[PDB]
Amino acid sequence: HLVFTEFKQMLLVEAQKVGDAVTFYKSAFGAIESHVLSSELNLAGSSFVVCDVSSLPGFSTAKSEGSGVTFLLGTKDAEAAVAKAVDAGAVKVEVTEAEVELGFKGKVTDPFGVTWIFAE
Amino acid sequence: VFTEFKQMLLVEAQKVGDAVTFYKSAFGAIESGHSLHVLSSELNLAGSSFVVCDVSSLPGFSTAKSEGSGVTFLLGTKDAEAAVAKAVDAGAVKVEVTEAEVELGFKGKVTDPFGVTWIFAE
């Protein structure tokens, strides 16, 4: 019986970006914060960890130009969520008819190459 | 206010089952529910969870698997080499860790069949 003492999802960022990142996440979503340079951020009662890729030996880049990093957020107002994020630097992506069928009413990409879709 | 925050792992068309089966085998993930081939499945693991979903159901997105995705997870465990072999038997590929990677304590590393990099702490 092998067990794991914890499971975290690591959002890699380019060199010296962990700070621009929290900065952007604290703003666009209201995330709450908390060798390897990293910062744990909290949204909806769960967390992720933004990590500086240059501070993780073994890795070469954050793949920010084409990462498959995708998060889902639930809220009561997806339009107001997109607009808040865009005023903070995110780019609104039109939600396909398809995404609207799964209730995914809003969607944006951020400066770190992550894709966030709002599920209402 | 946000009421849920869930990572979405994008995988190859028709492969959500191979992933649901794989994640259970390698890590003992738990399927807390799914939606029908499988369109998506949320997996519980070590107190958290991630959702797996066939990209063919989400046009515009890209798994980024052929060019390396940045999907990275950390899993703390008592025996890293054991978890590495346990994951390799399910189809993952072992990545040797160097001394530089030792100072931090991550004595194992694999990239699963879905392009995810899993670091093991110990």
Side-chain angles (χ1 to χ4, degrees):
Chain A
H1 294 55
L2 183 54
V3 58
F4 300 105
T5 59
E6 63 184 49
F7 167 48
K8 299 180 293 190
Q9 37 201 52
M10 294 160 52
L11 193 172
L12 311 182
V13 294
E14 299 296 330
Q16 318 316 320
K17 298 299 181 171
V18 174
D20 297 337
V22 164
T23 316
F24 171 79
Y25 295 131
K26 266 180 182 167
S27 277
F29 302 124
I32 295 173
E33 176 167 46
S34 302
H35 61 62
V36 182
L37 174 43
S38 66
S39 172
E40 186 173 63
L41 292 174
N42 302 274
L43 292 167
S46 296
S47 50
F48 57 108
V49 187
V50 177
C51 304
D52 178 324
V53 74
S54 69
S55 75
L56 298 171
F59 290 73
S60 62
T61 68
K63 295 302 183 172
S64 65
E65 293 163 59
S67 78
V69 184
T70 309
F71 296 126
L72 170 161
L73 289 175
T75 190
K76 183 172 188 176
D77 197 339
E79 170 183 52
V82 164
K84 174 184 181 186
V86 167
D87 289 356
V91 174
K92 176 177 156 198
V93 175
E94 295 291 308
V95 297
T96 55
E97 190 277 348
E99 284 167 346
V100 183
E101 300 182 314
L102 291 168
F104 288 134
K105 292 298 173 63
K107 170 178 183 181
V108 304
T109 51
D110 67 23
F112 305 100
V114 175
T115 302
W116 301 83
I117 322 302
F118 298 130
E120 206 177 312
Chain B
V1 181
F2 291 117
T3 53
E4 64 184 326
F5 167 58
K6 302 189 178 291
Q7 187 160 357
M8 292 172 45
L9 167 63
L10 295 160
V11 302
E12 171 178 56
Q14 312 184 327
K15 298 336 175 168
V16 173
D18 273 319
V20 171
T21 302
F22 172 84
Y23 287 124
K24 294 177 180 182
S25 174
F27 309 126
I30 288 184
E31 191 162 44
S32 61
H34 66 179
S35 66
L36 284 58
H37 291 306
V38 188
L39 184 159
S40 68
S41 182
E42 181 163 342
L43 296 178
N44 293 337
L45 179 60
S48 301
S49 55
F50 59 111
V51 317
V52 178
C53 64
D54 177 329
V55 69
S56 61
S57 73
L58 287 161
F61 279 94
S62 174
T63 61
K65 184 195 171 283
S66 66
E67 303 299 71
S69 76
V71 181
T72 310
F73 297 124
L74 186 159
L75 280 181
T77 175
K78 301 179 184 57
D79 186 337
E81 187 45 68
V84 167
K86 187 182 150 189
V88 162
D89 185 55
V93 181
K94 181 177 187 184
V95 183
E96 295 297 311
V97 293
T98 52
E99 187 47 57
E101 294 163 83
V102 185
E103 304 175 49
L104 304 181
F106 308 121
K107 297 178 181 174
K109 179 173 180 190
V110 303
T111 307
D112 60 32
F114 306 97
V116 178
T117 296
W118 295 86
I119 298 162
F120 297 97
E122 183 202 75

Tab-separated table of all heavy atoms in Angstrom, chain B residues 11-21 31 34-41 52-57:
chain	number	residue	atom	x	y	z
B	11	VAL	N	-6.491	15.703	-22.545
B	11	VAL	CA	-5.852	14.525	-23.153
B	11	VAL	C	-6.449	14.210	-24.541
B	11	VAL	O	-7.520	14.726	-24.911
B	11	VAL	CB	-5.976	13.259	-22.295
B	11	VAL	CG1	-5.342	13.517	-20.884
B	11	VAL	CG2	-7.441	12.868	-22.162
B	12	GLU	N	-5.697	13.374	-25.256
B	12	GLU	CA	-6.013	12.900	-26.613
B	12	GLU	C	-7.476	12.448	-26.804
B	12	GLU	O	-8.079	11.841	-25.932
B	12	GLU	CB	-5.050	11.707	-26.938
B	12	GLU	CG	-5.439	11.006	-28.238
B	12	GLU	CD	-4.534	9.845	-28.695
B	12	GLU	OE1	-4.304	8.859	-27.934
B	12	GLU	OE2	-4.106	9.888	-29.885
B	13	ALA	N	-8.054	12.714	-27.979
B	13	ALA	CA	-9.400	12.241	-28.250
B	13	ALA	C	-9.504	10.732	-27.946
B	13	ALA	O	-8.575	9.944	-28.227
B	13	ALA	CB	-9.785	12.515	-29.760
B	14	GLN	N	-10.644	10.373	-27.352
B	14	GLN	CA	-10.981	9.006	-26.992
B	14	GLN	C	-10.132	8.434	-25.861
B	14	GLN	O	-10.288	7.269	-25.532
B	14	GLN	CB	-10.881	8.103	-28.237
B	14	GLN	CG	-11.590	8.719	-29.409
B	14	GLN	CD	-11.603	7.833	-30.660
B	14	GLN	OE1	-10.656	7.078	-30.925
B	14	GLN	NE2	-12.673	7.955	-31.449
B	15	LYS	N	-9.296	9.248	-25.229
B	15	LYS	CA	-8.423	8.675	-24.201
B	15	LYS	C	-8.754	8.978	-22.750
B	15	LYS	O	-7.931	8.684	-21.875
B	15	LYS	CB	-6.961	9.054	-24.452
B	15	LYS	CG	-6.349	8.516	-25.824
B	15	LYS	CD	-7.061	7.300	-26.352
B	15	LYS	CE	-6.515	6.880	-27.752
B	15	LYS	NZ	-7.043	5.513	-28.113
B	16	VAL	N	-9.912	9.571	-22.459
B	16	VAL	CA	-10.191	9.849	-21.030
B	16	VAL	C	-10.235	8.548	-20.242
B	16	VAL	O	-9.879	8.511	-19.074
B	16	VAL	CB	-11.548	10.606	-20.824
B	16	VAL	CG1	-11.875	10.712	-19.268
B	16	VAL	CG2	-11.415	12.033	-21.397
B	17	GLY	N	-10.654	7.450	-20.871
B	17	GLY	CA	-10.666	6.195	-20.081
B	17	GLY	C	-9.270	5.652	-19.792
B	17	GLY	O	-8.984	5.159	-18.682
B	18	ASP	N	-8.391	5.711	-20.795
B	18	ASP	CA	-7.021	5.216	-20.607
B	18	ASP	C	-6.362	6.034	-19.509
B	18	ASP	O	-5.478	5.545	-18.773
B	18	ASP	CB	-6.193	5.363	-21.884
B	18	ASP	CG	-6.330	4.159	-22.824
B	18	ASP	OD1	-6.336	3.009	-22.325
B	18	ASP	OD2	-6.418	4.397	-24.043
B	19	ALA	N	-6.766	7.306	-19.418
B	19	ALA	CA	-6.238	8.179	-18.364
B	19	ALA	C	-6.917	7.833	-17.009
B	19	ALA	O	-6.232	7.777	-15.964
B	19	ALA	CB	-6.518	9.693	-18.699
B	20	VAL	N	-8.237	7.667	-17.006
B	20	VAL	CA	-8.922	7.298	-15.747
B	20	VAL	C	-8.321	5.983	-15.282
B	20	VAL	O	-8.027	5.821	-14.112
B	20	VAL	CB	-10.487	7.068	-15.899
B	20	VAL	CG1	-11.022	6.488	-14.592
B	20	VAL	CG2	-11.255	8.451	-16.103
B	21	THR	N	-8.156	5.013	-16.195
B	21	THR	CA	-7.586	3.758	-15.741
B	21	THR	C	-6.143	3.908	-15.281
B	21	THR	O	-5.764	3.329	-14.249
B	21	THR	CB	-7.700	2.656	-16.825
B	21	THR	OG1	-9.084	2.502	-17.146
B	21	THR	CG2	-7.121	1.319	-16.290
B	31	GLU	N	-11.965	7.900	-8.718
B	31	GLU	CA	-12.951	8.547	-9.584
B	31	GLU	C	-14.195	8.958	-8.772
B	31	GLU	O	-15.030	8.118	-8.396
B	31	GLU	CB	-13.283	7.588	-10.728
B	31	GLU	CG	-14.075	8.196	-11.831
B	31	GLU	CD	-14.013	7.366	-13.104
B	31	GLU	OE1	-14.128	6.109	-13.044
B	31	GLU	OE2	-13.851	8.004	-14.168
B	34	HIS	N	-17.898	10.874	-13.282
B	34	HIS	CA	-17.447	11.132	-14.672
B	34	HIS	C	-18.640	11.451	-15.550
B	34	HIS	O	-19.769	11.430	-15.065
B	34	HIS	CB	-16.687	9.940	-15.274
B	34	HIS	CG	-17.508	8.705	-15.477
B	34	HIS	ND1	-16.988	7.552	-16.029
B	34	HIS	CD2	-18.809	8.440	-15.200
B	34	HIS	CE1	-17.934	6.629	-16.081
B	34	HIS	NE2	-19.048	7.142	-15.584
B	35	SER	N	-18.409	11.776	-16.823
B	35	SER	CA	-19.525	12.047	-17.734
B	35	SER	C	-19.237	11.391	-19.083
B	35	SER	O	-18.168	11.594	-19.665
B	35	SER	CB	-19.722	13.543	-17.908
B	35	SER	OG	-18.609	14.083	-18.562
B	36	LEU	N	-20.195	10.602	-19.567
B	36	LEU	CA	-20.053	9.878	-20.821
B	36	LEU	C	-20.258	10.720	-22.081
B	36	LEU	O	-21.373	11.125	-22.388
B	36	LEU	CB	-21.018	8.676	-20.846
B	36	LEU	CG	-20.615	7.467	-19.995
B	36	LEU	CD1	-20.451	7.889	-18.550
B	36	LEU	CD2	-21.664	6.351	-20.121
B	37	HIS	N	-17.115	6.017	-24.861
B	37	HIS	CA	-15.995	6.889	-24.485
B	37	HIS	C	-16.420	7.852	-23.384
B	37	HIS	O	-17.588	8.178	-23.252
B	37	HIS	CB	-15.472	7.666	-25.704
B	37	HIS	CG	-14.780	6.793	-26.711
B	37	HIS	ND1	-13.736	5.954	-26.374
B	37	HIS	CD2	-15.017	6.584	-28.030
B	37	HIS	CE1	-13.368	5.263	-27.438
B	37	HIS	NE2	-14.128	5.626	-28.457
B	38	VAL	N	-15.449	8.317	-22.606
B	38	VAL	CA	-15.712	9.230	-21.493
B	38	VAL	C	-15.372	10.648	-21.913
B	38	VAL	O	-14.320	10.896	-22.489
B	38	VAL	CB	-14.816	8.843	-20.272
B	38	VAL	CG1	-15.208	9.639	-19.038
B	38	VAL	CG2	-14.901	7.345	-20.024
B	39	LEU	N	-16.252	11.587	-21.632
B	39	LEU	CA	-15.979	12.956	-22.002
B	39	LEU	C	-15.095	13.625	-20.943
B	39	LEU	O	-14.308	14.515	-21.260
B	39	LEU	CB	-17.295	13.723	-22.124
B	39	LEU	CG	-17.312	15.189	-22.588
B	39	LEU	CD1	-18.715	15.526	-23.113
B	39	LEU	CD2	-16.933	16.134	-21.464
B	40	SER	N	-15.283	13.230	-19.686
B	40	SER	CA	-14.456	13.812	-18.624
B	40	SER	C	-14.610	12.996	-17.362
B	40	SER	O	-15.569	12.183	-17.206
B	40	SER	CB	-14.845	15.273	-18.341
B	40	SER	OG	-16.123	15.382	-17.762
B	41	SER	N	-13.625	13.131	-16.483
B	41	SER	CA	-13.676	12.433	-15.207
B	41	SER	C	-12.884	13.178	-14.155
B	41	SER	O	-11.725	13.498	-14.404
B	41	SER	CB	-13.138	11.008	-15.347
B	41	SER	OG	-13.245	10.351	-14.081
B	52	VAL	N	-9.926	15.261	-15.725
B	52	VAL	CA	-9.304	14.814	-16.991
B	52	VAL	C	-10.329	14.932	-18.094
B	52	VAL	O	-11.414	14.383	-17.955
B	52	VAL	CB	-8.940	13.319	-16.966
B	52	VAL	CG1	-8.332	12.926	-18.400
B	52	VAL	CG2	-7.884	13.028	-15.946
B	53	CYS	N	-9.959	15.533	-19.222
B	53	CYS	CA	-10.992	15.663	-20.221
B	53	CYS	C	-10.490	15.635	-21.646
B	53	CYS	O	-9.618	16.392	-22.007
B	53	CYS	CB	-11.684	16.942	-20.037
B	53	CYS	SG	-10.586	18.256	-20.315
B	54	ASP	N	-11.095	14.753	-22.438
B	54	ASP	CA	-10.761	14.584	-23.869
B	54	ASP	C	-10.802	15.960	-24.574
B	54	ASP	O	-11.817	16.615	-24.519
B	54	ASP	CB	-11.864	13.687	-24.397
B	54	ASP	CG	-11.774	13.411	-25.889
B	54	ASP	OD1	-11.287	14.262	-26.666
B	54	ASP	OD2	-12.196	12.291	-26.219
B	55	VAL	N	-9.740	16.389	-25.252
B	55	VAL	CA	-9.784	17.729	-25.883
B	55	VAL	C	-10.780	17.796	-27.059
B	55	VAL	O	-11.404	18.827	-27.326
B	55	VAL	CB	-8.360	18.125	-26.352
B	55	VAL	CG1	-7.949	17.223	-27.532
B	55	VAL	CG2	-8.286	19.594	-26.712
B	56	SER	N	-10.975	16.683	-27.743
B	56	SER	CA	-11.931	16.710	-28.883
B	56	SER	C	-13.305	17.259	-28.447
B	56	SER	O	-14.160	17.622	-29.266
B	56	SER	CB	-12.063	15.323	-29.509
B	56	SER	OG	-12.552	14.334	-28.607
B	57	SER	N	-13.552	17.304	-27.139
B	57	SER	CA	-14.800	17.869	-26.642
B	57	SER	C	-14.703	19.380	-26.443
B	57	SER	O	-15.723	20.029	-26.120
B	57	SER	CB	-15.190	17.259	-25.248
B	57	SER	OG	-14.310	17.789	-24.225
